[PDB]
Each structure stands twice: as C-alpha cells, then as structure tokens.
Design an enzyme around this catalytic site. Structure first.
Site, mmCIF file in Angstrom:
data_model
loop_
_atom_site.group_PDB
_atom_site.id
_atom_site.type_symbol
_atom_site.label_atom_id
_atom_site.label_comp_id
_atom_site.label_asym_id
_atom_site.label_seq_id
_atom_site.Cartn_x
_atom_site.Cartn_y
_atom_site.Cartn_z
ATOM 1 N N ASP A 160 -6.917 -3.959 16.899
ATOM 2 C CA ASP A 160 -7.307 -5.254 16.347
ATOM 3 C C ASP A 160 -6.250 -6.313 16.065
ATOM 4 O O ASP A 160 -6.474 -7.235 15.278
ATOM 5 C CB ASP A 160 -8.340 -5.106 15.225
ATOM 6 C CG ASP A 160 -8.969 -6.442 14.836
ATOM 7 O OD1 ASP A 160 -8.989 -7.357 15.688
ATOM 8 O OD2 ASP A 160 -9.435 -6.582 13.684
ATOM 9 N N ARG A 164 -4.376 -11.955 10.843
ATOM 10 C CA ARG A 164 -4.961 -11.471 9.586
ATOM 11 C C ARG A 164 -4.507 -10.014 9.357
ATOM 12 O O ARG A 164 -4.519 -9.616 8.241
ATOM 13 C CB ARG A 164 -6.463 -11.734 9.619
ATOM 14 C CG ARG A 164 -7.280 -10.532 10.016
ATOM 15 C CD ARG A 164 -7.570 -10.226 8.593
ATOM 16 N NE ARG A 164 -8.462 -9.150 8.436
ATOM 17 C CZ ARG A 164 -8.359 -8.332 7.431
ATOM 18 N NH1 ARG A 164 -8.984 -8.610 6.313
ATOM 19 N NH2 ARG A 164 -7.622 -7.253 7.543
ATOM 20 N N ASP A 178 -2.927 -1.929 8.733
ATOM 21 C CA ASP A 178 -4.096 -1.178 9.192
ATOM 22 C C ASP A 178 -3.977 -0.645 10.617
ATOM 23 O O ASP A 178 -4.931 -0.726 11.389
ATOM 24 C CB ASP A 178 -5.345 -2.056 9.086
ATOM 25 C CG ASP A 178 -5.633 -2.482 7.663
ATOM 26 O OD1 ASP A 178 -5.066 -1.869 6.738
ATOM 27 O OD2 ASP A 178 -6.423 -3.429 7.473
HETATM 28 C C1 LIG Z 1 0.894 -6.106 -4.034
HETATM 29 C C2 LIG Z 1 1.097 -7.609 -3.852
HETATM 30 F F1 LIG Z 1 2.063 -7.834 -2.880
HETATM 31 C C3 LIG Z 1 -0.220 -8.260 -3.429
HETATM 32 O O1 LIG Z 1 -1.133 -8.378 -4.246
HETATM 33 N N1 LIG Z 1 -0.252 -8.626 -2.130
HETATM 34 C C4 LIG Z 1 -1.311 -9.246 -1.591
HETATM 35 C C5 LIG Z 1 -2.092 -10.165 -2.283
HETATM 36 C C6 LIG Z 1 -3.163 -10.776 -1.644
HETATM 37 C C7 LIG Z 1 -3.440 -10.486 -0.311
HETATM 38 C C8 LIG Z 1 -2.657 -9.584 0.401
HETATM 39 C C9 LIG Z 1 -2.970 -9.328 1.737
HETATM 40 C C10 LIG Z 1 -1.597 -8.962 -0.258
HETATM 41 N N2 LIG Z 1 -0.808 -8.096 0.391
HETATM 42 C C11 LIG Z 1 -1.189 -6.826 0.624
HETATM 43 N N3 LIG Z 1 -0.234 -5.944 0.951
HETATM 44 C C12 LIG Z 1 -0.537 -4.602 1.223
HETATM 45 C C13 LIG Z 1 -1.852 -4.161 1.168
HETATM 46 O O2 LIG Z 1 -2.121 -2.842 1.430
HETATM 47 C C14 LIG Z 1 -3.335 -2.571 2.143
HETATM 48 C C15 LIG Z 1 -3.170 -1.450 2.975
HETATM 49 C C16 LIG Z 1 -3.525 -0.169 2.557
HETATM 50 CL CL1 LIG Z 1 -4.170 0.102 0.982
HETATM 51 C C17 LIG Z 1 -3.354 0.915 3.409
HETATM 52 O O3 LIG Z 1 -3.730 2.135 2.918
HETATM 53 C C18 LIG Z 1 -3.799 3.140 3.936
HETATM 54 C C19 LIG Z 1 -2.831 0.754 4.686
HETATM 55 C C20 LIG Z 1 -2.478 -0.526 5.095
HETATM 56 O O4 LIG Z 1 -1.958 -0.789 6.326
HETATM 57 C C21 LIG Z 1 -1.254 0.351 6.828
HETATM 58 C C22 LIG Z 1 -2.649 -1.622 4.254
HETATM 59 CL CL2 LIG Z 1 -2.207 -3.180 4.801
HETATM 60 C C23 LIG Z 1 -2.836 -5.085 0.828
HETATM 61 N N4 LIG Z 1 -2.473 -6.422 0.563
#
Ligand SMILES: */C=C(/F)C(=O)Nc1cccc(C)c1Nc1ncc(OCc2c(Cl)c(OC)cc(OC)c2Cl)cn1
Length: 299
Positions: A160, A164, A178
């Site tokens: 994907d 985003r 992801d």
């Molecule tokens: C923690 C701060 F930096 C924060 O709140 N960041 C933030 C705020 C708003 C929107 C976004 C996109 C964002 N950043 C962010 N960074 C990492 C994240 O982790 C999600 C995630 C997870 Cl939980 C997992 O788990 C397996 C895998 C993965 O990939 C690999 C990601 Cl991106 C969410 N948001």
C-alpha cells in the site's frame, strides 16, 4: 497463552497508556510513555506507540496481530522504517510497541506546510519563503526509497505504499509505516473511500489491481504515485477521477500529468515507475541512486 520471547518482551507496568491515535480493522493504536525501553537507563521516559486488540476481538484478530508482531521481529531495524521496540505478551493483553513519529504522516506534513498563498499579507523579509524547499522534498523521496530498498532486501512487499503510510519524525526522518500488515488482497473493495476521502485503489500497480499480482516492482509503481504526492505537496492522485473512470483510464494506459513546479528529472522518475511492464520500472536500488544524484547536485 503466548510463548515468552525474552529478546523482545517488555514489562507492561513500564507503560503508561495515553491518547488513542487510531482504531480500525488492524487493532487500535495508543500513544504511551515507556520507562526503561533502554535497559541501561531503567527510569528514562520515552514516547512510543502501542498497538493492541479492540474490545471483542476474535481469535482471528489475535492471530493477525501476533503475525504482524512476528513479521516485524523478522524484518529487523532500519532508520527509515517504523521500528519494533518491544512486546507485552505475558500476564495481560497483547501489546506491540513501536516508534512514534512526532510530526504525523507525510501527506499531512506536506499539506500543512504548503507555501504562503498571495492571499496572505507580506510581513518581514521572508514573506514568500514557505517551510518546504526542493532539496528537502527530494530528501523525503530519497529516504522513502532507502526504506523500501531495505524492506526489499528482507523480502517484504508493502502493498500500500503511500504518503499516508510514511511517517515523519521530529527531525524530518521518513519512516515507512504498516509494512507488515495483512491487507486481505483477495477481498479489496476497490470503491472504498476512507474517513479522510482516500481511495487506496489509486496507488495499486496494474498487475496488482487487475491480476492480483504483487512483486517489489508493484511497490515501485506505488512509489511513483508517492513521488507525485510529494511534489504536489500532499495532493490526491488522479484528480477528480472516480474509481469507475480510473479502471477504464488505466486500461487505456492513462498516466498523471506533470505537476506544477516539478523539474523534468522527477516527473521522469514518476513515469519510469509507471511503465506498464514491471521489469521496465526502476528497482528501488536504482531509485535510491537516481535520487541521490539529484540530492548531491542540489545540496
Ligand atoms: C507518538 C507521537 F509521535 C504521536 O502522537 N505521533 C503521531 C500523532 C498523530 C499522527 C501520527 C501519525 C503520529 N505518528 C505516529 N507514529 C507511530 C505510530 O505507530 C503506529 C504503528 C503501530 Cl502501533 C504499529 O504496531 C505494529 C506498526 C506501525 O508500522 C510498523 C505503526 Cl506506524 C502511529 N502514529
């Protein structure tokens, strides 16, 4: 019931859960403070992201999360991907702890930093200088390509790749998000529109969309779309074209126009990425080198 993996296991009582970041089919994500993620400094705080299951998750949901966890273990660490930090599998709910990027995803990062429009009154000596410059845009593209090259070397197909799904750290480092998701490629609603209006079908390579075939060259196609997103500063691809029209246009070999204020070098790379034959698209290694040449010429 899950087996202990001491390499990755992190005591859940060293987490303090905070604001929810998102919820969906893939579980829910919560921002959290972690203490002693670095065992050398047991009382040091850090901000992380925690994936967990939802309310009445099924056994399949648990299996999906365990799978993503193991995939992230396998793939290893790289600067330009969202890295696994630890897991909580013992005596409580399953947590998967990863790096949290401060500045959000690349699409929103770009859209929030579009240059001042003439509608704003000039004030001071930098009135027309926006936050985004060409070398930084190129750096963003280069970093994503580096991350994908790494993921490629570990036999990972993203499926994907989009702005985003690229996150931005406090230091403007690109981190691919992801990459280990089970995405259910045999039951994609091609007409699906997200809560933010995204039509994910617009990032699919033709062989993926039409033939359900994915290779790394399929990701290269998606990278081309991502290139277009970057140099439109977070624009949506195939402007004004709904999914039904996208189908027929792609069958006719339609490609997006060269965006405004985009040098021919970069539109050239986009069009290479969108070549019909997968083998006629560049590899990520070639994209890294190509973008590095531009970067060095402008840095
Ligand atoms: C923690 C701060 F930096 C924060 O709140 N960041 C933030 C705020 C708003 C929107 C976004 C996109 C964002 N950043 C962010 N960074 C990492 C994240 O982790 C999600 C995630 C997870 Cl939980 C997992 O788990 C397996 C895998 C993965 O990939 C690999 C990601 Cl991106 C969410 N948001």
């Amino acid at each position: 019931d899950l087996p202990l993996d001491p390499l990755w296991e992190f005591p859940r009582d060293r987490l303090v859960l905070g604001k929810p970041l998102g919820e969906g089919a893939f579980g829910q994500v919560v921002r959290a403070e972690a203490f002693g993620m670095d065992p050398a400094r047991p009382d040091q705080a850090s901000t992380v992201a925690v994936k967990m299951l939802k309310d009445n998750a099924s056994d399949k949901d648990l299996a999906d999360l365990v799978s993503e966890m193991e995939v992230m273990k396998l793939i290893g660490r790289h600067k330009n991907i969202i890295n696994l930090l630890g897991v909580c599998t013992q005596e409580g709910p399953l947590y998967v702890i990863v790096e949290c990027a401060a500045k959000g995803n690349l699409r929103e990062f770009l859209r929030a930093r579009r240059p001042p429009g003439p509608d704003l009154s000039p004030d001071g000596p930098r009135s027309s200088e926006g936050p985004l410059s060409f070398p930084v845009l190129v750096s963003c593209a280069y970093q994503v390509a580096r991350g994908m090259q790494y993921l490629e070397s570990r036999k990972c197909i993203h499926r994907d790749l989009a702005a985003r799904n690229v996150l931005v750290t406090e230091d403007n480092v690109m981190k691919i998000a992801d990459f280990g998701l089970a995405r259910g490629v045999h039951h994609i609603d091609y007409y699906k529109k997200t809560s933010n209006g995204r039509l994910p079908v617009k990032w699919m390579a033709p062989e993926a969309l039409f033939d359900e075939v994915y290779t790394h060259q399929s990701d290269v196609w998606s990278f081309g779309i991502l290139l277009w997103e970057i140099f439109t500063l977070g624009g949506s691809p195939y402007p004004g074209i709904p999914v039904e029209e996208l189908f027929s246009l792609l069958r006719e070999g339609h490609r997006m126009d060269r965006p405004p204020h985009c040098p021919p070098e970069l539109y050239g790379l986009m069009r290479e990425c969108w070549h019909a034959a997968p083998s006629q698209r560049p590899t990520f290694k070639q994209l890294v080198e190509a973008l590095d040449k531009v970067l060095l010429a402008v840095s």
